[PDB]
Design an enzyme around this catalytic site. Sequence first.
Site, mmCIF file in Angstrom:
data_model
loop_
_atom_site.group_PDB
_atom_site.id
_atom_site.type_symbol
_atom_site.label_atom_id
_atom_site.label_comp_id
_atom_site.label_asym_id
_atom_site.label_seq_id
_atom_site.Cartn_x
_atom_site.Cartn_y
_atom_site.Cartn_z
ATOM 1 N N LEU A 25 0.813 -1.221 0.000
ATOM 2 C CA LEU A 25 0.000 0.000 0.000
ATOM 3 C C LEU A 25 0.845 1.269 0.000
ATOM 4 O O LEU A 25 0.402 2.316 -0.493
ATOM 5 C CB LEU A 25 -0.972 0.014 1.198
ATOM 6 N N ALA A 27 5.245 2.866 1.136
ATOM 7 C CA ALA A 27 6.609 2.758 1.642
ATOM 8 C C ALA A 27 7.028 4.113 2.217
ATOM 9 O O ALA A 27 6.643 5.163 1.690
ATOM 10 C CB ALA A 27 7.554 2.339 0.528
ATOM 11 N N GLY A 28 7.766 4.061 3.320
ATOM 12 C CA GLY A 28 8.285 5.226 4.027
ATOM 13 C C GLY A 28 9.708 4.999 4.492
ATOM 14 O O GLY A 28 10.383 4.078 4.013
ATOM 15 N N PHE A 30 10.564 4.431 7.821
ATOM 16 C CA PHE A 30 10.496 3.418 8.870
ATOM 17 C C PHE A 30 10.046 2.010 8.372
ATOM 18 O O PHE A 30 10.226 1.040 9.101
ATOM 19 C CB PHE A 30 9.628 3.915 10.044
ATOM 20 N N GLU A 32 7.430 -0.471 5.150
ATOM 21 C CA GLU A 32 6.319 -0.571 4.183
ATOM 22 C C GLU A 32 4.999 -1.049 4.806
ATOM 23 O O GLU A 32 5.004 -1.800 5.775
ATOM 24 C CB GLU A 32 6.668 -1.415 2.944
ATOM 25 N N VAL A 33 3.872 -0.570 4.262
ATOM 26 C CA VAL A 33 2.515 -0.911 4.723
ATOM 27 C C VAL A 33 1.884 -1.811 3.676
ATOM 28 O O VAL A 33 1.863 -1.463 2.492
ATOM 29 C CB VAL A 33 1.619 0.320 5.004
ATOM 30 N N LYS A 47 2.333 -3.226 9.042
ATOM 31 C CA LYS A 47 3.473 -2.320 8.880
ATOM 32 C C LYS A 47 4.717 -3.157 9.186
ATOM 33 O O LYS A 47 4.832 -3.676 10.302
ATOM 34 C CB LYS A 47 3.395 -1.110 9.833
ATOM 35 N N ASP A 138 0.815 14.714 16.375
ATOM 36 C CA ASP A 138 0.964 14.702 14.912
ATOM 37 C C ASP A 138 -0.413 14.635 14.270
ATOM 38 O O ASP A 138 -0.678 13.834 13.361
ATOM 39 C CB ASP A 138 1.873 13.547 14.467
#
Length: 274
Positions: A25, A27-28, A30, A32-33, A47, A138
Amino acid sequence: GHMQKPWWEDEWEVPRETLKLVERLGAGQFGEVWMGYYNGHTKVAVKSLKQGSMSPDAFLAEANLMKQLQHQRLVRLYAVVTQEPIYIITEYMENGSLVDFLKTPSGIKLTINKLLDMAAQIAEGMAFIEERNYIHRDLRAANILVSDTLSCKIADFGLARLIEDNEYTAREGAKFPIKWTAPEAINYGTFTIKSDVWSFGILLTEIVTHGRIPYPGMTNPEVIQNLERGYRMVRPDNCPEELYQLMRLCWKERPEDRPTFDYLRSVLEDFFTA
Ligand SMILES: COc1ccc2c(C(=O)Nc3ccc(NC(=O)c4nn(C)c5ccccc45)cc3C)cnn2c1
Ligand code: NI
């Protein structure tokens, strides 16, 4: 069935063989989702922590909103997998992040009544977080998830904190998203439920504009300079004046003058029922 776990594993541990990862879904930094399935029939979000991005203890702390707070308005933690790659498993939110949902063909068509309803739903979840002595830190449309029924839930990605004495102080080298962050948190690193209220006023601008970046055409230094003079964000386009005045309560200079989340929820409910 009301009439009827190894210590080295998390109290929320599930064997990795109970999960089947199907679709990436996102990627970041920290990790991937993924959209996956738990025991074949239950859709879940997974996650997977990027090995090296951060420590296991920080990603899996018991401190810690998802392990402590459960509510219909909060993304529910299901389980964790503590052997590398580390998994955090949660309830699946079909329509993903609010900021992405608002830009889809169905999100663009949302009436003002539905946008106010969704805003009231976030304030309802935040009123729960406030009452539990937590701060989110946040609160922006990117961290609101949307279900298949168009209901909203608040997600935490490790910034939420339990406040003992009403406030948390951030570290010397901490960097936060300036456009959503209250002045006292930018200047002194002091975060309270009142800096979440400031953030909620900014989030309201993302809701009414269908996911636009706050303070259009302004850089972060121009935002800080404007705030210092007493200016607030320019009235967004298609923003009802009553909503704009509710945003301005959220942006009061003195944190103690900003409303509670319960008050915000109550007004927003009145706005969409009128
Ligand atoms: C359709 O598109 C989409 C896109 C995304 C999603 C999600 C989703 O994102 N769910 C979700 C929410 C929060 C987390 N938490 C963390 O990643 C986490 N990271 N740190 C450092 C923590 C520290 C403490 C606690 C938690 C964390 C994990 C997931 C998996 C659900 N449905 N869904 C549908
Ligand atoms: Ni029973």
